[PDB]
Amino acid sequence: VQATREDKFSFGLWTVGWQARDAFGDATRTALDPVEAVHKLAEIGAYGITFHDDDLVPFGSDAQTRDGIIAGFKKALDETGLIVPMVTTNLFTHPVFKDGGFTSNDRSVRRYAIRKVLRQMDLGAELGAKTLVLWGGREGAEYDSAKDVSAALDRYREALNLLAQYSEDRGYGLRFAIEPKPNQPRGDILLPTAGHAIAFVQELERPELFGINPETGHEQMSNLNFTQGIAQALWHKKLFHIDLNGQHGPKFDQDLVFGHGDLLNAFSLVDLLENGPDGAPAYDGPRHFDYKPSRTEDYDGVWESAKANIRMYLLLKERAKAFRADPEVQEALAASKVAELKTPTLNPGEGYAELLADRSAFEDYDADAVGAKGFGFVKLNQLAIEHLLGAR
Amino acid sequence: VQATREDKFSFGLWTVGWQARDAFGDATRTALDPVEAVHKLAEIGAYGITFHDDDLVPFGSDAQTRDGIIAGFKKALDETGLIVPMVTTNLFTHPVFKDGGFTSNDRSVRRYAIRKVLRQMDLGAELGAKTLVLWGGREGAEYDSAKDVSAALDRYREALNLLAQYSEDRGYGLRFAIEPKPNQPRGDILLPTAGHAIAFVQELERPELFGINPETGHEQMSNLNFTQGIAQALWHKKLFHIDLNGQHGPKFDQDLVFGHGDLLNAFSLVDLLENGPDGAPAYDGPRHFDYKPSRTEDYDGVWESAKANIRMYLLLKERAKAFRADPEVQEALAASKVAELKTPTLNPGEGYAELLADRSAFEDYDADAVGAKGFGFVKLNQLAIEHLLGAR
Amino acid sequence: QATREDKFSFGLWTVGWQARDAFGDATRTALDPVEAVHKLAEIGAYGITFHDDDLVPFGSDAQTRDGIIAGFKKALDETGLIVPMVTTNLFTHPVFKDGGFTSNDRSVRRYAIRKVLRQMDLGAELGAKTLVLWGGREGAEYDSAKDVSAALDRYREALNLLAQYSEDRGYGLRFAIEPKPNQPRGDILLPTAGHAIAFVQELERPELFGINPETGHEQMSNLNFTQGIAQALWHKKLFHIDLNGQHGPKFDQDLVFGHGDLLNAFSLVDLLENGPDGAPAYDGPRHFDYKPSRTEDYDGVWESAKANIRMYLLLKERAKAFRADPEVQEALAASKVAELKTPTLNPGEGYAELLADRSAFEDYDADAVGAKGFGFVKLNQLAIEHLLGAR
Amino acid sequence: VQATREDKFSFGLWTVGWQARDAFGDATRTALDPVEAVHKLAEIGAYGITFHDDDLVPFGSDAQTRDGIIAGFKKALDETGLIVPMVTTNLFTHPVFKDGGFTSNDRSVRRYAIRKVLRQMDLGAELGAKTLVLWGGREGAEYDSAKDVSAALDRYREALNLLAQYSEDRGYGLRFAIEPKPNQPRGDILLPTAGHAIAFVQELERPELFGINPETGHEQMSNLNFTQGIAQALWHKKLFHIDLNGQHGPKFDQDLVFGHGDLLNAFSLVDLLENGPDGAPAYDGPRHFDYKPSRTEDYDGVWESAKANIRMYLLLKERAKAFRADPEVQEALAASKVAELKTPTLNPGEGYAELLADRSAFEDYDADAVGAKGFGFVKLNQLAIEHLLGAR
Ligand SMILES: O=C[C@H](O)[C@@H](O)[C@H](O)CO
Ligand SMILES: O=C[C@H](O)[C@@H](O)[C@H](O)CO
Ligand SMILES: O=C[C@H](O)[C@@H](O)[C@H](O)CO
Ligand SMILES: O=C[C@H](O)[C@@H](O)[C@H](O)CO
Ligand SMILES: [Mg+2]
Ligand SMILES: [Mg+2]
Ligand SMILES: [Mg+2]
Ligand SMILES: [Mg+2]
């Protein structure tokens, strides 16, 4: 198929621009020019581009240079019609952030980290971005006694409250998306899963402005069900953005093309986002790919991988719809009682008093007979998969 | 050392009573009489005993039988002075619960699950229990299309609000603690980590009556840092109860004696719980051991293992105390700047306007010089381990 | 549709699993063995396997035992099903709580061998060609409780005996050690396919020993199952295979083959079928060692049995199409997959000739070579598209 | 308390020399001078140093430079009395090795990789090294269809056979140690575990010259039991060298100080290596630390961390000795029948026929009665932990 701007496929500058310098080796590709990136991505079907401050403007650029880069960058967007849906700040590369940005043990680093974000918020606001993604990659520890978690959560909250204050007062209208990750680069990162991140956000001053940006690989690094966590995120209404990529369970973060890691879970994820209630998608934000072209590839492999992300999503979408439209699947869903879960356990107006009065819910309930009936889940799964294989 | 009632060590009837029938074999031990279990626990220094409805009263016992059991039980409690600080319900054993209790796709099972719990709340309230633990072991799925998570969270919530209501109205004064687990027995369980449970609890009708009951091995099954997750639970003030045991990373749940799995994390956990703010413990509920005596042991090994849990806790407590009273450790803490995290990042009355005006926070900040100072974390970790090893 | 040439087999204990798990009672009633034979024959299975204790209840008197066997043989006869492999339950009974062959208790070890000898005679009687040995209770929960070195000596001692016996009696059995990292023990001896092959190389008649790797068992450690099978085939030790599905490191799920890591299920079928000639690289039984989920009744059980065969045949078809695609041939050429098969050295070349080749070092432009891409993502993308029936 | 040359502690130049440039950030430490490294290690008690060709001589140095560096290095060893027990080659950093050295799909890379190694073998021999470690970090793949494993193993073997031929012909008397690793940097690496590396070695032309160099964290990345793995390597007599470090389960390779990851396994490991048959160690090679001083530390932190490894090993040794020497432990071992595993299952000269005729081994065997006796394993384990904690 073909991507449309209505699909809202976005990519970070750092994705197709990853030079492939890994933990054990030198870069295998030369640097990617941002203007070219804009052009190349516009060409493959992306509707937007994102970036960290330092991806666009080299750390420690004088004003003139910085200004110079932005102006050229805006031209390219202009020309191509791409937007900047989200912006983020690099609080992990420079040595000063070795112990964190917002929660560094060092107070001077914390103050600096906030200044650095404020400045990116301004550029973001100016480019029309709606979301500020916050990935606290250096927030965490290698040793338990080196970090007071409670104090760290206080300092994290303290920084977020300020950013919300600023944005509201300047009238930027940003939404903030906290990105959880279990480890890498710290032995243990704070807010390790989608869950911890949502619980945290609920403790902020203007919780309505905060959500999460879960990434496929991050949850899989802990062997969690990505689709299920996204389902919980949507239940809470905190899915402000999403990072799509592939991973092969608990190991270093691979950042593969979306659907190149856990294919079955990539399938159910697309089904959840698109086969939303009232026909429509359950999620309307950017479908952002935060992946990395393998170290073994050249610039051609890079564009190939960029396109593979889009094809994977559209092929899966196509099969999720067919699946839902299949009468045999409909019959299987019925036998599995999937929809009976949507009917309240209690009859309208019933409370514990009436439930207690219902002998059929306990005293006269035949648990044994109910326990003998199967749910037909295997058959239902077999049909989903045959839809995925294009075997139906 | 010796355990005192002030230590608040409690054990589940199902721990020392596990007959050791595992997934691949038959029981290796005969059943333990509840009265006998009360006497033996009292003798090793436990202050309380806990149980699932079905551990005490065999599933489907007539009222005369049940009444007889309860009465004999109360006598033992009376005679020994042990208390029942928490009670729980078995919503996982009987075949009727194969697709869950509160979230089974089948409506009638959902209604029966609630009645089974209400009945247990009554007995709990009569025994003086203050906490009702909820472990939704069957709430989840093996296949993504078999369960509507959103509908499931709705149903979960629907059941829990009723329980709070009933408890409120009857004046039971119970606190509810949801126990997260990532998998086992379902392929994926709903509310997989302490984070997900906390975020969920925040959405109930009366969040104040709800917290979590996190278990050491459950978080380690996902290879998460248990101590750090507890630290976050404490920050939210949602640590209502705790299950202590041992585990060796991501694999089936082993339920070893506390400290026999990740020893270093057990050590930092005891430090966190007992060396709380203001001299005193950061947590005051029961120190509950939800473990299983290894299948290779006989009743002698069973009491040995019951005693090993307490010994382990007391030995680590002793070492945690010594660790903190060491002037050298104190000096390392100061050099690592642990306490400096506790100081707000912003000066009193400082806002973004003032922060933006501080050139020392950015314009004149020497990132490069700060980035070069070491935190001394390794040295601090080494002193901690030397304390644990009794080498200091 | 399955044919006897596909060689699909199932263990009696897979479809017959009552779904009594670590936390709940059984949700299904017992399956009758004759019935299992008839139902499996019906879905296209060519063979059935069993642990001694799955067919003949532990402790049956000879009359009883004899009665059951005669019944079973008759069902085989009628349906035309064979018994390619047999195994022994050395894990259920309490006596085996510390192991069969490597129990600390000498008397259990002796008994463990007697139990297996007995099953060997029955296997021989039924025409089985492979004896699978799953040492599920061999290992430990605590490091000081088990002397690993003495354990391997005792594991070896027991196997050498079994081989002697088989060889003296003319049974012609092949022995396949089944590795598992854990469950039921905290740590099981011979935890991966690699550990088991290395061990087998140390027995008295190594040619008689190989392995029986299980998809889920390697995945429990997060290992690449296909890649381990490739190494097993290279050593020529793939004597049998147990297929099922798993979702990484967690308890063993025993899902239907292909319901866990689908990409790896695809590369595995490609490996086993798109062998050397045009021919399969593996000629043994495709054994499904799985469990129908606890949420299912007997209709679910038969559906899950068929799902295993369906997944393999669907994967096979896509594997074949993948290889026949000219676009794939082109990507394989760009990726230099086949260049790996050409020896690094030219015929008759040794270290002296290599050392004299200035072009292999002194004049080698590493920077230039390091800049060319392998085109692996593109190759991967064509593979997935074949899998999805998108081409 | 103090290290002796008899302890055989070695460190790789790349360990203390790691500048802390990780996957997400820039180096936080300056480069370490090889000569200085030699003096500092000599000073902390190390008996030897190891290096990758490229750690000592910058990739692409002319012979004049190369030669000068070697001469200075040689001097330092001279003055300090340190030896070079092992050398290794870097076949992972340079972009040319992106698909492997010996198993690169590119034939020219394979020829080049062999040449690089032959050269390092020459330097090794000149410095007196006895072991050549081969870590095939880039041998493997991210995608299944990209690598023919069979062909790969043929090419790995082809290369290794030539290396043995050469050493043997030049009379170097080297031993070759293959270092297994499951992943990082490739998605999956060939010879992922100690078991796979041993099986492979058995297929070489002169297998007696080959063994493995297992690393603590490498086996732990797969959640395997490192001690049990070493036990198997010792049974085969293939433990040619060993890399000690710490790791926290399946996640990126942390390379912490030895014993700072799984402490309990670090303990059983020292016990295995040191309490060998008849008092003597079961292993006689170097106790090599292949770790990295955390990114948060400075050079002070670096030397501290170097010493921490030595300390950890000697503290554990000390407790392993005391554990074994304790008559209570000796009694628990007897009760658990640990040594009974050493007695052959079969009586002297007993074969299948005598065993088949022994009614006590089957017909008259009381399995139910034996099945009920406990093994006393929890208690033995508790005794071990108490010795570790310095409580006994
Ligand atoms: O693990 C790295 C993160 O995924 C990163 O790319 C963020 O999303 C942006 O800072
Ligand atoms: O994994 C089992 C659970 O931990 C259970 O013991 C709960 O704590 C109470 O049902
Ligand atoms: O994990 C269980 C094993 O796979 C078992 O079924 C063997 O294959 C036969 O005992
Ligand atoms: O994972 C990195 C390896 O441990 C490496 O240090 C080798 O031992 C030497 O090439
Ligand atoms: Mg991301
Ligand atoms: Mg529990
Ligand atoms: Mg099997
Ligand atoms: Mg190493």
Side-chain angles (χ1 to χ4, degrees), chain B residues 7-16 41 46-52 55 83-88 133 179 213-216 226 240-246 256 258 269 273 283-291 309-310 313:
Chain B
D7 289 321
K8 309 189 207 212
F9 294 132
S10 43
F11 292 85
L13 181 51
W14 70 91
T15 71
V16 290
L41 293 169
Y47 98 121
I49 193 172
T50 68
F51 63 97
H52 295 83
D55 299 331
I83 61 154
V84 177
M86 176 279 269
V87 298
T88 192
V133 153
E179 184 162 351
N213 181 42
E215 175 165 305
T216 315
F226 189 63
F240 281 14
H241 188 271
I242 193 159
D243 280 357
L244 306 163
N245 65 10
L256 307 167
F258 174 65
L269 172 77
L273 298 187
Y283 164 74
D284 59 77
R287 278 65 171 155
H288 190 245
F289 302 110
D290 183 4
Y291 91 107
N309 280 284
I310 297 168
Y313 194 102

Side-chain angles (χ1 to χ4, degrees), chain C residues 97 106 143 168 201-202 351, chain D residues 169 202 268 344 352 373:
Chain C
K97 69 190 172 183
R106 181 174 192 262
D143 298 335
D168 291 358
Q201 297 165 328
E202 305 288 343
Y351 64 78
Chain D
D169 285 1
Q202 291 166 330
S268 65
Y352 61 77
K373 297 168 188 235

Side-chain angles (χ1 to χ4, degrees), chain C residues 18-32:
Chain C
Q18 283 184 268
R20 166 162 226 197
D21 67 17
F23 281 105
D25 295 326
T27 64
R28 290 191 290 270
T29 58
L31 173 58
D32 164 75

